[PDB]
């Protein structure tokens, strides 16, 4: 179905010398039976858990696909390149667990219009840019760790941040604002 | 004099005119009077006059050397696998002797020259593989002697040509795979008497199947697959007298299947699958001795004829998606060598035929979302060829065979939403390939045996909703590819162990609504890729271990449990407001706790 | 993409 092939697509894209993704057999009418996929009782994806998988290469766009997806669980592997904008296609999302990669590029603004997300954790990548405004509308966010990343810029203090402590905004290139030491120009 | 060749002069010529990276054409020494024993020439005649040329696979680069039409006696040339680039040139037809051409796997481009009809020699045109764009030519109708035409994997944009059907002497038709303009099948395809291969996938076909393709006597391969054709399945296709394969899938068909296909001896292979085709499948068709029916993702309805378990020739049968009742045939596998049974979403019933592994060749049994009632056959024990077992969400009932447990090469035993009763059984151990367990929402009794422990390779283990009971075998823990456990739903007693430190890959730990006793173990925090913890609805004691605050856990219930003391202060936030509930020691900055 | 020519594989 669309779902088990955007996930193929992804599975193309994606080095994998521990062969984790060995059971993501195309012909198969759904991902459900996949391994490290889990689907709802409607036979659609609501998780994917690829965390310490030693998985290297890049996000695809396709992921955008799986709409009633929850939980992305794609840290503690060497995965590379951008954060796909079409994630913000996920609207069902509830963790962004992207953490202890090699990720580039900017946080996609579109990462705002994830209404049901709670946890946003991309700390430990090489992420640059600004941290997008968006972010703060995001009245279900819990947990964010933006931490030990390469972003510069103002950090929100309104919204979900209102809540957020230094810790989760800690080791970045040039981060100004009241979290941070350093006032913003 | 006048039988004297400049062969090998005009084959250097070619040398020059393609770029050749790799050295394959070293052979071919200027000094040597005679082209004849150079690498891929043949001189098959008296003289020393070239009569073929084959450089496949050569990495040879460059346009295409139009110098060896000079070759007065050349009759076959390959150059398949190389790097030819630039349209095809139109002074080709100077090649007058050409029998066969391979330009296949090429990187030709441009419009198909039409001076090819022009060659009165060609028997075999293969331009597969390349970038061919346009119409194709209205020279190609004229074609004299050709039997084979492929111009499958090229980019030609043009409608599909009526007058292609105008060549009498074509057996092989192979179109598939191009971008053409929404076309029609032209009912002058009908007039292709000599034609053994209709090979038109992924051609952008729309309308209804010609009634004029029955006339294809001699047809061996029907493939019009992965198009958009709409209407019946043409009943003039029992005419087709030598078909073997009948390709139709993934169409807009409707209509019913046709009962003359049965009238189709020689018939051994159909899928007319992900059609809208209704009605009952016909008797007859199914009296044929078929080796593939695939009719899956249709609206057929009505019982599978009995007529399918004659043929001793069935390997592969898919009807799932169908609307589709009554039983399936009781001699079903016992006169053929079964490999594949998908039944799965149909409306069938009663008791799963004895002996589908008779001939020992089953791999995958699908019949999930059907009403098959009674016991798993016990032949099923001795079918060690099985791969795949999905079972589930039917009406079985009684204790699962003993061996059936232990089959070597099942990678997933489904018997999800059964009345399956009795245990597991210590023969279980032998499941060698066995990935993933679900038998969730059964009537499964007993303890787990400490066997499960020996499938190292086991990487679920889902068996919710079940009567099972006792503490968890220690051998669980060993278990280290293991990445869902959910036994919520049990009886299971006992206590946890530090061995859960074991369980490195263990990503959902869900022991929930069991009679679980003891601390959680400490050792619960040293689980890198758990994500997600249930251990509500049991007897766990004691402070909640400060490991869980290592954890990033996007799911937490302790809920309804005997816990006591102070909440670790990364657990005192509101998104844990009721993961902690109906544990009365409990006293954390929580508006619901003490 | 390009599969010879033959049955559809899909299974459950
Ligand atoms: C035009 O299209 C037709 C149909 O699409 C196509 O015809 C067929 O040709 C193919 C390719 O040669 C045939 O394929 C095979 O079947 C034969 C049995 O007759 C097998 O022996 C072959 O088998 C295997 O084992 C080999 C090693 O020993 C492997 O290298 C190989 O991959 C196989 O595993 C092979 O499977 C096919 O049988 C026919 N079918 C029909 C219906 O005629 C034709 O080739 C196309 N021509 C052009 C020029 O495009
Ligand atoms: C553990 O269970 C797994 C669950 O299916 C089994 O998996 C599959 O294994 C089979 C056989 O190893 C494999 O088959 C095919 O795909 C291959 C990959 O391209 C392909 O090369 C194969 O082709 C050929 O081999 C077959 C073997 O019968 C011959 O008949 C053919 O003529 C040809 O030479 C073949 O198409 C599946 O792809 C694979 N599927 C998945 C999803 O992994 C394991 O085999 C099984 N292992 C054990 C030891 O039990
Ligand atoms: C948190 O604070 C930020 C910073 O002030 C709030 O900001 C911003 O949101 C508004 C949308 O209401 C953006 O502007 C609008 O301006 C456009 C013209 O560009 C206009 O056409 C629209 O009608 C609208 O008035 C503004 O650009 C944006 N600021 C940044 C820096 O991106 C944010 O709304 C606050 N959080 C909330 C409300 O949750
Ligand atoms: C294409 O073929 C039709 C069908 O023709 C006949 O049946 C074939 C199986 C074969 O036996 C042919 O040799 C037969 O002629 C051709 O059709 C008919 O045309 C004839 C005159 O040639 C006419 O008297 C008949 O009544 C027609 N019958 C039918 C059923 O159509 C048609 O002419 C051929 N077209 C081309 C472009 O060659
Ligand atoms: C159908 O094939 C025949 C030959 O098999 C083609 O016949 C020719 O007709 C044209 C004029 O229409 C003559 O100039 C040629 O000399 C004929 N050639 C032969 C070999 O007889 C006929 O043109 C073809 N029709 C189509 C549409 O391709
Ligand atoms: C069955 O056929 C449909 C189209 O009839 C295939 O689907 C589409 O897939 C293409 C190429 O991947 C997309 O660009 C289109 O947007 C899709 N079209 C529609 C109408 O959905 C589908 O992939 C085929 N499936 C199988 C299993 O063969
Ligand atoms: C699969 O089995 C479960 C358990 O027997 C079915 O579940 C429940 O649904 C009924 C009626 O809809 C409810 O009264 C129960 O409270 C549910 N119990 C549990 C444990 O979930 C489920 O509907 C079955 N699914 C199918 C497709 O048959
Ligand atoms: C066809 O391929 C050949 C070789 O890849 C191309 O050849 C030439 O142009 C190159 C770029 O300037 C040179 O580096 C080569 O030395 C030269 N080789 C020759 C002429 O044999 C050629 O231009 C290609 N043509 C097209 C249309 O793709
Ligand atoms: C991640 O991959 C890149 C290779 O492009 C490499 O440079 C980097 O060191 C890798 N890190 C690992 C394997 O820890
Ligand atoms: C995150 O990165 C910092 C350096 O940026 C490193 O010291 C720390 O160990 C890393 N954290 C994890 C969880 O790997
Ligand atoms: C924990 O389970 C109880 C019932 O078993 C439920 O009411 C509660 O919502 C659950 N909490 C969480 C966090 O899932
Ligand atoms: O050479 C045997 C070969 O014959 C042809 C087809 O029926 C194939 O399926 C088969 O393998
Ligand atoms: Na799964
Ligand atoms: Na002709
Ligand atoms: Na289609």
Redesign the interface.
């Known amino acids: 179905n669309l779902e088990g092939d955007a996930l193929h697509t992804l599975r193309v894209t994606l080095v994998d010398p521990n062969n984790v993704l060995q059971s993501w057999d195309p ?4 991902p459900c ?1 996949w391994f490290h996929v889990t689907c709802n009782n409607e036979n659609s994806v609501i998780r994917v858990d690829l965390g310490n998988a030693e998985l290297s290469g890049h996000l695809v766009p396709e992921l955008g696909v799986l709409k009633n997806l929850q939980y992305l669980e794609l840290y503690s592997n060497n995965i590379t390149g951008p954060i796909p904008s079409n994630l913000g296609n996920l609207t069902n999302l509830v963790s962004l667990d992207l953490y202890l990669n090699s990720f580039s590029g900017p946080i996609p603004e579109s990462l705002g219009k994830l209404s049901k997300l709670r946890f946003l954790r991309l700390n430990n990548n090489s992420l640059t840019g600004s941290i997008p405004m968006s972010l703060t509308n995001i009245t279900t966010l819990q947990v964010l760790d933006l931490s030990n990343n390469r972003l510069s810029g103002s950090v929100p203090d309104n919204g979900s941040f209102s809540l957020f402590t230094p810790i989760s905004f800690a080791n970045n290139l040039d981060l100004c604002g009241p979290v941070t030491s350093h006032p913003c120009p | 004099s006048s039988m004297d060749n400049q062969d090998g002069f005009i084959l250097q010529q070619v040398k020059l005119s393609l770029d050749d990276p790799d050295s394959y054409l070293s052979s071919w020494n200027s000094n040597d009077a005679s082209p004849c024993r150079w690498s891929g020439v043949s001189c098959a005649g008296d003289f020393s006059s070239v009569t073929s040329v084959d450089l496949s696979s050569a990495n040879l680069a460059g346009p295409f050397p139009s110098v060896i039409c000079r070759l007065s006696n050349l009759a076959h040339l390959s150059l398949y696998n190389n790097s030819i680039n630039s349209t095809l040139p139109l002074n080709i037809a100077a090649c007058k002797s050409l029998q066969t051409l391979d330009l296949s796997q090429n990187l030709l481009t441009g419009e198909l020259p039409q001076t090819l009809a022009d060659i009165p020699t060609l028997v075999h045109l293969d331009l597969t593989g390349n970038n061919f764009s346009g119409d194709i030519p209205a020279s190609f109708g004229k074609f004299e002697n050709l039997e084979v035409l492929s111009l ?2 090229n980019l030609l944009d043009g409608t599909i040509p009526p007058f292609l059907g105008n060549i009498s002497t074509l057996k092989m038709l192979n179109l ?2 191009n971008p053409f303009s929404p076309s029609r099948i032209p009912p002058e395809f009908g007039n292709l008497t000599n034609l053994e ?1 209709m ?1 038109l ?2 051609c952008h076909l729309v309308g209804q199947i010609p009634d004029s393709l029955g006339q294809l006597s001699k047809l061996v ?1 029907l ?1 019009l ?1 992965l198009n958009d054709l709409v209407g019946h399945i043409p009943p003039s296709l029992g005419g087709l007298t030598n078909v073997v ?1 009948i ?1 139709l ?2 169409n807009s068909l409707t209509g019913e299947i046709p009962p003359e296909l049965g009238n189709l001896k020689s018939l051994r ?1 159909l ?1 007319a ?2 059609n809208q085709l209704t009605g009952k499948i016909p008797d007859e068709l199914c009296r044929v001795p078929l080796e ?1 029916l ?1 009719l ?2 249709n609206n057929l309805e009505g019982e599978l004829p009995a007529s399918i378990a004659l043929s001793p020739n069935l390997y ?1 049968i ?1 009807i ?1 998606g169908n609307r589709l009742t009554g039983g399936l045939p009781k001699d079903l596998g016992l006169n053929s060598p079964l490999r ?1 049974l ?1 039944v ?2 149909n409306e069938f019933s009663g008791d799963l035929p004895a002996d589908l592994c008779a001939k020992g060749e089953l791999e ?1 049994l ?1 019949i ?1 979302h059907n009403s098959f009632s009674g016991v798993i056959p016990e032949s099923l024990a001795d079918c060690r060829s099985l791969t ?1 077992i ?1 079972l589930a969400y039917n009406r079985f009932s009684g204790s699962v065979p003993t061996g059936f447990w232990g089959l070597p090469h099942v990678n997933l035993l489904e018997l999800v939403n059964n009345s399956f009763s009795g245990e597991i059984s210590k023969s279980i151990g032998g499941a060698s390939n066995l990935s993933l367990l679900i038998l969730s929402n059964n009537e499964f009794t007993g303890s787990l045996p400490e066997e499960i422990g020996s499938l190292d390779n086991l990487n679920q283990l889902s068996a919710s909703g079940n009567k099972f009971s006792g503490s968890l075998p220690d051998s669980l823990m060993s278990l280290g590819e293991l990445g869902t456990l959910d036994l919520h739903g049990n009886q299971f007693s006992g206590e946890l162990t530090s061995g859960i430190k074991s369980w490195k890959k263990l990503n959902e730990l869900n022991l929930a609504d069991n009679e679980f006793t003891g601390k959680i173990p400490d050792e619960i925090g040293s689980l890198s890729v758990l994500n997600y913890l249930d251990l509500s609805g049991n007897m766990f004691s004691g402070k909640i271990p400060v490991s869980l605050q290592s954890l990033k856990l996007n799911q937490l219930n302790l809920s309804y449990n005997r816990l006591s003391g102070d909440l670790p202060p990364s657990l005192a936030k509101d998104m844990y407001k009721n993961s902690f509930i109906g544990n009365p020691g409990l006293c954390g900055d929580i508006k619901g706790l003490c | ?3 010879p ?8």
Do not use: K
Request: charged share 25%; no cysteine.
């Open positions: 012909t198969l009418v759904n039976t | 499958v994997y598939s795979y291969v090979w996938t992924e391969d493939d697959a394969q390709e899938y993934n292979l899928d699958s992900m593939s695939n899956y993702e592969e898919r799932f594949w998908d799965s979403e995958e699908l999930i795949r999905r | 993409r390009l599969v020519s033959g049955p559809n594989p899909l299974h459950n």
